[PDB]
Amino acid sequence: PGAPWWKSAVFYQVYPRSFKDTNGDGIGDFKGLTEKLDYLKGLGIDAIWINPHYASPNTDNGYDISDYREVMKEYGTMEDFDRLMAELKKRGMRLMVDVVINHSSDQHEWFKSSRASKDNPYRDYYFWRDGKDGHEPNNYPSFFGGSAWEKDPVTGQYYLHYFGRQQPDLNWDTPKLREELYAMLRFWLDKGVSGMRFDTVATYSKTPGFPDLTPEQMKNFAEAYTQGPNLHRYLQEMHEKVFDHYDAVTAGQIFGAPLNQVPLFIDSRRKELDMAFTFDLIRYDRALDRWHTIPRTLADFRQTIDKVDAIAGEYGWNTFFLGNHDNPRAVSHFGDDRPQWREASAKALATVTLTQRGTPFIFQGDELGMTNYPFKTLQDFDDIEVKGFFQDYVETGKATAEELLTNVALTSRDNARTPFQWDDSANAGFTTGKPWLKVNPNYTEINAAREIGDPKSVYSFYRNLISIRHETPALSTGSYRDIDPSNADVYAYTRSQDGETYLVVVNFKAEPRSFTLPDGMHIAETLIESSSPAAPAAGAASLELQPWQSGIYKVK
Ligand SMILES: OC[C@H]1O[C@@](CO)(O[C@H]2O[C@H](CO)[C@@H](O)[C@H](O)[C@H]2O)[C@@H](O)[C@@H]1O
Ligand SMILES: [Ca+2]
């Protein structure tokens, strides 16, 4: 048999708000993305995942939806959306949209009705509960600061919100709400959408009785919210009522779940989701409070990857990504973003990204080597997660504003949201007005127009890697094997399929290193290298590596 298209596709994540503005209001829009499809097509992209594009008050930039069937005013009209669809099809590309059904905006008609009275027909579309002992129903904290329970004076009860107070959680325990959600998914699927990424898919099921979390659970509340007892019954129901009738690919953002539970979401035999976005790797150096960082080495990096890969087993499938809209920039996070090493290391990371087993997702800008942004004050962050950390750690005296800044400058998701750098015109060609979030000053040296024609740019290296992966089955669907989980200097692994074996070797040190191939293995050909002065000799049994050198080889 053949492997589904999604297992050998290369996806690109577009955060519309920061991709391309075409009417100078400072916010990216659909017309801007449509206008750039040739750029994505030329890069070699097969499919695009776009962040939320529905009507939203934007308290959380698309993730607080006020109407699942209208497009966000800032991005355009349904007509623009359809046009995007049509233009992607002409290029043989597929669109994956974001599905945010753990919560809705508090401006959605369902919630406006729900909060009116305890007897309103929409009361149970959400979670309403009496406070206890003079305060909230229980000790549940919110991802974005303070309590997860908000009191509504209209009825005297509190409603639940794992996220923003303007993002009340939807009540999956209510059949009528589930059916409405299924009918809303068909509305988009009927328009031809090829894939759906499920926002915080592991938190749909709530714990009966809402008992207080234990002190330990409070330490990692994100994990506790992924343990609802009806989760998989609900995901299986959604697959049977909806996905069974279409040929869309499903990808779940399993945030907060213990890795050992991931197979329940992706084992194809369970008929739940097709693939998984996990966070063990991207948060491998993040502390439990989600804002401090902890020092890690390449040994920790590869070991996490091996664990995640082993979790897909035979019937499951993983996505692979080094960056997205909720995390710091890939080259700053995992590579070395100092001027003299940024390009070499961004190419190294590209080699890792495109040779991993699973479906890779390239986050907008990483193909250029975009970096974290030089925040100077807390006022430079738009992110509500940061305002939340201020409320929970500074106002409470657990940390000073300076300590918060020092740390969130390295972890804030806003590092990934500064406008895409198209060229060196005003605001790097992202807008003719004022960008909603400041463009990085390094756009003068890091921009698409400058890299596109240069054979040695980070962009060209990504383009070349994508081509190589597309022509080498082993690099998408082949087996994966880490050659030395304990080595903290050089990442080396093999990918194999149908008797064909490839070797990937990436130096993660800003110093020369050597690599001896497994005994019995010899280089056969060199497919590509970055930052290398000369390819190895056919038959080489070892490799000399320059600082941050990466290479893909066919062995024998
Ligand atoms: O970004 C912060 C925070 O939210 C997570 C889910 O736990 O991600 C998804 O849902 C959020 C709320 O809907 C969005 O703000 C975010 O953009 C979306 O990916 C995690 O990434 C993280 O804990
Ligand atoms: Ca615009």
Side-chain angles (χ1 to χ4, degrees), residues 60 63 103 143-144 163 167 197 199-200 253 255 325-326 385 413 417:
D60 186 24
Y63 286 94
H103 46 276
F143 276 105
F144 300 157
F163 299 88
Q167 284 162 303
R197 175 268 190 181
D199 187 59
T200 180
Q253 178 209 29
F255 193 86
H325 65 299
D326 290 333
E385 184 162 41
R413 49 195 205 164
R417 313 177 169 192

PDB file of all heavy atoms in Angstrom, residues 60 63 103 143-144 163 167 197 199-200 253 255 325-326 385 413 417, ligand 1:
ATOM      1  N   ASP A  60      -7.276  36.946  22.506  1.00  0.00           N
ATOM      2  CA  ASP A  60      -6.181  35.972  22.403  1.00  0.00           C
ATOM      3  C   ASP A  60      -5.912  35.661  20.921  1.00  0.00           C
ATOM      4  O   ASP A  60      -5.714  34.498  20.508  1.00  0.00           O
ATOM      5  CB  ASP A  60      -6.552  34.725  23.200  1.00  0.00           C
ATOM      6  CG  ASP A  60      -5.426  33.695  23.286  1.00  0.00           C
ATOM      7  OD1 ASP A  60      -4.229  34.049  23.143  1.00  0.00           O
ATOM      8  OD2 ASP A  60      -5.754  32.508  23.530  1.00  0.00           O
ATOM      9  N   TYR A  63      -8.037  32.866  19.095  1.00  0.00           N
ATOM     10  CA  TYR A  63      -8.414  31.756  19.957  1.00  0.00           C
ATOM     11  C   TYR A  63      -9.629  31.993  20.871  1.00  0.00           C
ATOM     12  O   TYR A  63      -9.957  31.145  21.706  1.00  0.00           O
ATOM     13  CB  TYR A  63      -7.190  31.324  20.761  1.00  0.00           C
ATOM     14  CG  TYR A  63      -6.218  30.580  19.883  1.00  0.00           C
ATOM     15  CD1 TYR A  63      -5.138  31.248  19.252  1.00  0.00           C
ATOM     16  CD2 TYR A  63      -6.395  29.221  19.623  1.00  0.00           C
ATOM     17  CE1 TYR A  63      -4.268  30.562  18.383  1.00  0.00           C
ATOM     18  CE2 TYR A  63      -5.527  28.522  18.747  1.00  0.00           C
ATOM     19  CZ  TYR A  63      -4.467  29.199  18.135  1.00  0.00           C
ATOM     20  OH  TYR A  63      -3.617  28.482  17.297  1.00  0.00           O
ATOM     21  N   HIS A 103     -12.992  25.913  24.223  1.00  0.00           N
ATOM     22  CA  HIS A 103     -13.595  27.117  24.767  1.00  0.00           C
ATOM     23  C   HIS A 103     -14.031  28.009  23.624  1.00  0.00           C
ATOM     24  O   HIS A 103     -13.609  27.796  22.484  1.00  0.00           O
ATOM     25  CB  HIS A 103     -12.581  27.877  25.660  1.00  0.00           C
ATOM     26  CG  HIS A 103     -11.215  28.011  25.055  1.00  0.00           C
ATOM     27  ND1 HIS A 103     -10.250  27.024  25.153  1.00  0.00           N
ATOM     28  CD2 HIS A 103     -10.682  28.977  24.264  1.00  0.00           C
ATOM     29  CE1 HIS A 103      -9.191  27.371  24.438  1.00  0.00           C
ATOM     30  NE2 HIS A 103      -9.428  28.553  23.888  1.00  0.00           N
ATOM     31  N   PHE A 143      -4.358  29.419  32.975  1.00  0.00           N
ATOM     32  CA  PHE A 143      -3.125  29.499  32.216  1.00  0.00           C
ATOM     33  C   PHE A 143      -2.670  30.959  32.083  1.00  0.00           C
ATOM     34  O   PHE A 143      -1.473  31.242  32.009  1.00  0.00           O
ATOM     35  CB  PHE A 143      -3.367  28.949  30.797  1.00  0.00           C
ATOM     36  CG  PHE A 143      -3.265  27.462  30.687  1.00  0.00           C
ATOM     37  CD1 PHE A 143      -4.406  26.679  30.570  1.00  0.00           C
ATOM     38  CD2 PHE A 143      -2.012  26.838  30.657  1.00  0.00           C
ATOM     39  CE1 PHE A 143      -4.316  25.293  30.419  1.00  0.00           C
ATOM     40  CE2 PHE A 143      -1.904  25.431  30.500  1.00  0.00           C
ATOM     41  CZ  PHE A 143      -3.071  24.655  30.380  1.00  0.00           C
ATOM     42  N   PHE A 144      -3.653  31.858  32.010  1.00  0.00           N
ATOM     43  CA  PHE A 144      -3.423  33.279  31.818  1.00  0.00           C
ATOM     44  C   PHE A 144      -3.588  34.173  33.036  1.00  0.00           C
ATOM     45  O   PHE A 144      -3.876  35.367  32.896  1.00  0.00           O
ATOM     46  CB  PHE A 144      -4.308  33.794  30.681  1.00  0.00           C
ATOM     47  CG  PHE A 144      -4.051  33.117  29.357  1.00  0.00           C
ATOM     48  CD1 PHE A 144      -5.034  33.103  28.365  1.00  0.00           C
ATOM     49  CD2 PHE A 144      -2.808  32.545  29.077  1.00  0.00           C
ATOM     50  CE1 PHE A 144      -4.785  32.531  27.106  1.00  0.00           C
ATOM     51  CE2 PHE A 144      -2.548  31.973  27.826  1.00  0.00           C
ATOM     52  CZ  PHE A 144      -3.542  31.966  26.836  1.00  0.00           C
ATOM     53  N   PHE A 163      -8.399  29.125  30.196  1.00  0.00           N
ATOM     54  CA  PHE A 163      -7.594  30.194  29.642  1.00  0.00           C
ATOM     55  C   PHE A 163      -8.109  31.586  30.047  1.00  0.00           C
ATOM     56  O   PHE A 163      -8.440  31.829  31.218  1.00  0.00           O
ATOM     57  CB  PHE A 163      -7.491  30.021  28.104  1.00  0.00           C
ATOM     58  CG  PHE A 163      -6.835  28.721  27.702  1.00  0.00           C
ATOM     59  CD1 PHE A 163      -7.595  27.553  27.541  1.00  0.00           C
ATOM     60  CD2 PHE A 163      -5.445  28.630  27.601  1.00  0.00           C
ATOM     61  CE1 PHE A 163      -6.972  26.317  27.296  1.00  0.00           C
ATOM     62  CE2 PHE A 163      -4.800  27.389  27.353  1.00  0.00           C
ATOM     63  CZ  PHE A 163      -5.564  26.240  27.202  1.00  0.00           C
ATOM     64  N   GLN A 167     -12.601  33.545  27.590  1.00  0.00           N
ATOM     65  CA  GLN A 167     -12.616  32.256  26.891  1.00  0.00           C
ATOM     66  C   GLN A 167     -13.257  31.152  27.757  1.00  0.00           C
ATOM     67  O   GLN A 167     -12.596  30.208  28.182  1.00  0.00           O
ATOM     68  CB  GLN A 167     -11.179  31.835  26.495  1.00  0.00           C
ATOM     69  CG  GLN A 167     -10.595  32.571  25.313  1.00  0.00           C
ATOM     70  CD  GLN A 167      -9.074  32.448  25.236  1.00  0.00           C
ATOM     71  OE1 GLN A 167      -8.364  32.810  26.190  1.00  0.00           O
ATOM     72  NE2 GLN A 167      -8.563  31.954  24.098  1.00  0.00           N
ATOM     73  N   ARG A 197      -6.388  21.092  12.863  1.00  0.00           N
ATOM     74  CA  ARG A 197      -5.484  21.027  13.998  1.00  0.00           C
ATOM     75  C   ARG A 197      -6.338  21.388  15.187  1.00  0.00           C
ATOM     76  O   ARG A 197      -6.905  22.487  15.255  1.00  0.00           O
ATOM     77  CB  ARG A 197      -4.363  22.053  13.817  1.00  0.00           C
ATOM     78  CG  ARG A 197      -3.394  22.189  14.968  1.00  0.00           C
ATOM     79  CD  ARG A 197      -3.824  23.279  15.932  1.00  0.00           C
ATOM     80  NE  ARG A 197      -2.762  23.577  16.910  1.00  0.00           N
ATOM     81  CZ  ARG A 197      -2.867  24.476  17.893  1.00  0.00           C
ATOM     82  NH1 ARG A 197      -3.981  25.194  18.043  1.00  0.00           N
ATOM     83  NH2 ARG A 197      -1.861  24.636  18.746  1.00  0.00           N
ATOM     84  N   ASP A 199      -6.928  22.592  18.748  1.00  0.00           N
ATOM     85  CA  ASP A 199      -6.389  23.375  19.856  1.00  0.00           C
ATOM     86  C   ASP A 199      -6.639  22.689  21.236  1.00  0.00           C
ATOM     87  O   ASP A 199      -7.790  22.349  21.549  1.00  0.00           O
ATOM     88  CB  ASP A 199      -7.047  24.735  19.869  1.00  0.00           C
ATOM     89  CG  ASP A 199      -6.411  25.662  20.887  1.00  0.00           C
ATOM     90  OD1 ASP A 199      -5.204  25.888  20.730  1.00  0.00           O
ATOM     91  OD2 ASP A 199      -7.097  26.137  21.811  1.00  0.00           O
ATOM     92  N   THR A 200      -5.579  22.500  22.040  1.00  0.00           N
ATOM     93  CA  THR A 200      -5.673  21.856  23.354  1.00  0.00           C
ATOM     94  C   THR A 200      -6.783  20.797  23.332  1.00  0.00           C
ATOM     95  O   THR A 200      -7.822  20.918  23.993  1.00  0.00           O
ATOM     96  CB  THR A 200      -5.852  22.887  24.556  1.00  0.00           C
ATOM     97  OG1 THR A 200      -5.930  22.144  25.779  1.00  0.00           O
ATOM     98  CG2 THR A 200      -7.086  23.802  24.406  1.00  0.00           C
ATOM     99  N   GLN A 253      -3.324  19.136  19.179  1.00  0.00           N
ATOM    100  CA  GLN A 253      -2.325  19.796  20.003  1.00  0.00           C
ATOM    101  C   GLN A 253      -2.580  19.205  21.390  1.00  0.00           C
ATOM    102  O   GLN A 253      -3.441  19.692  22.144  1.00  0.00           O
ATOM    103  CB  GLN A 253      -2.507  21.332  20.060  1.00  0.00           C
ATOM    104  CG  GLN A 253      -1.452  21.989  20.973  1.00  0.00           C
ATOM    105  CD  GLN A 253      -1.916  23.285  21.656  1.00  0.00           C
ATOM    106  OE1 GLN A 253      -3.109  23.475  21.927  1.00  0.00           O
ATOM    107  NE2 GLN A 253      -0.959  24.167  21.976  1.00  0.00           N
ATOM    108  N   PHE A 255      -1.595  19.329  24.491  1.00  0.00           N
ATOM    109  CA  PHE A 255      -0.793  20.047  25.452  1.00  0.00           C
ATOM    110  C   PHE A 255      -1.078  19.649  26.874  1.00  0.00           C
ATOM    111  O   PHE A 255      -2.235  19.616  27.304  1.00  0.00           O
ATOM    112  CB  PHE A 255      -0.966  21.553  25.301  1.00  0.00           C
ATOM    113  CG  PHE A 255       0.069  22.338  26.045  1.00  0.00           C
ATOM    114  CD1 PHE A 255       1.304  22.624  25.440  1.00  0.00           C
ATOM    115  CD2 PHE A 255      -0.139  22.709  27.376  1.00  0.00           C
ATOM    116  CE1 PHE A 255       2.309  23.255  26.147  1.00  0.00           C
ATOM    117  CE2 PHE A 255       0.857  23.350  28.108  1.00  0.00           C
ATOM    118  CZ  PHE A 255       2.088  23.628  27.507  1.00  0.00           C
ATOM    119  N   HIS A 325       3.641  29.314  17.076  1.00  0.00           N
ATOM    120  CA  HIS A 325       3.206  30.610  17.584  1.00  0.00           C
ATOM    121  C   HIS A 325       3.150  30.736  19.119  1.00  0.00           C
ATOM    122  O   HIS A 325       2.798  31.800  19.639  1.00  0.00           O
ATOM    123  CB  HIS A 325       1.809  30.914  17.024  1.00  0.00           C
ATOM    124  CG  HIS A 325       0.764  29.959  17.509  1.00  0.00           C
ATOM    125  ND1 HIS A 325       0.818  28.603  17.257  1.00  0.00           N
ATOM    126  CD2 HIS A 325      -0.340  30.155  18.266  1.00  0.00           C
ATOM    127  CE1 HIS A 325      -0.207  28.006  17.844  1.00  0.00           C
ATOM    128  NE2 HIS A 325      -0.924  28.926  18.467  1.00  0.00           N
ATOM    129  N   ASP A 326       3.464  29.666  19.838  1.00  0.00           N
ATOM    130  CA  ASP A 326       3.371  29.693  21.302  1.00  0.00           C
ATOM    131  C   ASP A 326       4.734  29.534  21.993  1.00  0.00           C
ATOM    132  O   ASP A 326       4.804  29.405  23.218  1.00  0.00           O
ATOM    133  CB  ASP A 326       2.494  28.544  21.796  1.00  0.00           C
ATOM    134  CG  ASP A 326       1.037  28.723  21.464  1.00  0.00           C
ATOM    135  OD1 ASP A 326       0.578  29.864  21.316  1.00  0.00           O
ATOM    136  OD2 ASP A 326       0.332  27.696  21.381  1.00  0.00           O
ATOM    137  N   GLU A 385      -0.290  35.932  28.111  1.00  0.00           N
ATOM    138  CA  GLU A 385       0.305  34.928  29.000  1.00  0.00           C
ATOM    139  C   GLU A 385       1.329  35.645  29.905  1.00  0.00           C
ATOM    140  O   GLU A 385       1.477  35.325  31.094  1.00  0.00           O
ATOM    141  CB  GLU A 385       0.991  33.812  28.213  1.00  0.00           C
ATOM    142  CG  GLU A 385       1.526  32.701  29.122  1.00  0.00           C
ATOM    143  CD  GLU A 385       1.825  31.398  28.407  1.00  0.00           C
ATOM    144  OE1 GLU A 385       2.369  31.424  27.300  1.00  0.00           O
ATOM    145  OE2 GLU A 385       1.534  30.332  28.962  1.00  0.00           O
ATOM    146  N   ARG A 413       5.876  33.761  23.809  1.00  0.00           N
ATOM    147  CA  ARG A 413       5.469  33.385  22.478  1.00  0.00           C
ATOM    148  C   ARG A 413       5.512  34.600  21.536  1.00  0.00           C
ATOM    149  O   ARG A 413       5.507  34.461  20.300  1.00  0.00           O
ATOM    150  CB  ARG A 413       4.063  32.750  22.528  1.00  0.00           C
ATOM    151  CG  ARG A 413       3.053  33.523  23.306  1.00  0.00           C
ATOM    152  CD  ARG A 413       1.793  32.694  23.648  1.00  0.00           C
ATOM    153  NE  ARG A 413       0.658  33.600  23.845  1.00  0.00           N
ATOM    154  CZ  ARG A 413      -0.623  33.233  23.851  1.00  0.00           C
ATOM    155  NH1 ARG A 413      -0.960  31.958  23.682  1.00  0.00           N
ATOM    156  NH2 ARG A 413      -1.566  34.157  23.978  1.00  0.00           N
ATOM    157  N   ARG A 417       5.861  35.977  17.121  1.00  0.00           N
ATOM    158  CA  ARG A 417       4.816  36.746  16.460  1.00  0.00           C
ATOM    159  C   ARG A 417       5.208  38.061  15.849  1.00  0.00           C
ATOM    160  O   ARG A 417       4.328  38.763  15.337  1.00  0.00           O
ATOM    161  CB  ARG A 417       3.656  36.972  17.443  1.00  0.00           C
ATOM    162  CG  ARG A 417       3.252  35.667  18.180  1.00  0.00           C
ATOM    163  CD  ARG A 417       2.154  35.836  19.222  1.00  0.00           C
ATOM    164  NE  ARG A 417       1.666  34.530  19.653  1.00  0.00           N
ATOM    165  CZ  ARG A 417       0.560  34.338  20.378  1.00  0.00           C
ATOM    166  NH1 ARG A 417      -0.172  35.383  20.755  1.00  0.00           N
ATOM    167  NH2 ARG A 417       0.173  33.101  20.704  1.00  0.00           N
TER     168      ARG A 417
HETATM  169  O1  LIG B   1      -0.052  29.820  24.575  1.00  0.00           O
HETATM  170  C1  LIG B   1      -0.268  29.476  25.585  1.00  0.00           C
HETATM  171  C2  LIG B   1      -0.784  28.164  26.133  1.00  0.00           C
HETATM  172  O2  LIG B   1      -1.882  27.721  25.414  1.00  0.00           O
HETATM  173  C3  LIG B   1      -1.691  26.495  24.720  1.00  0.00           C
HETATM  174  C4  LIG B   1      -2.661  25.434  25.235  1.00  0.00           C
HETATM  175  O3  LIG B   1      -2.412  24.973  26.729  1.00  0.00           O
HETATM  176  O4  LIG B   1      -2.071  26.569  23.316  1.00  0.00           O
HETATM  177  C5  LIG B   1      -3.290  26.751  22.474  1.00  0.00           C
HETATM  178  O5  LIG B   1      -4.421  27.358  23.168  1.00  0.00           O
HETATM  179  C6  LIG B   1      -4.254  28.683  23.703  1.00  0.00           C
HETATM  180  C7  LIG B   1      -5.560  29.087  24.300  1.00  0.00           C
HETATM  181  O6  LIG B   1      -6.592  28.711  23.333  1.00  0.00           O
HETATM  182  C8  LIG B   1      -3.793  29.646  22.630  1.00  0.00           C
HETATM  183  O7  LIG B   1      -3.585  30.951  23.280  1.00  0.00           O
HETATM  184  C9  LIG B   1      -2.522  29.170  21.958  1.00  0.00           C
HETATM  185  O8  LIG B   1      -2.154  30.113  20.958  1.00  0.00           O
HETATM  186  C10 LIG B   1      -2.937  27.758  21.290  1.00  0.00           C
HETATM  187  O9  LIG B   1      -1.887  27.125  20.570  1.00  0.00           O
HETATM  188  C11 LIG B   1      -0.259  26.054  24.996  1.00  0.00           C
HETATM  189  O10 LIG B   1       0.576  26.230  23.857  1.00  0.00           O
HETATM  190  C12 LIG B   1       0.185  26.968  26.168  1.00  0.00           C
HETATM  191  O11 LIG B   1       0.046  26.302  27.433  1.00  0.00           O
END
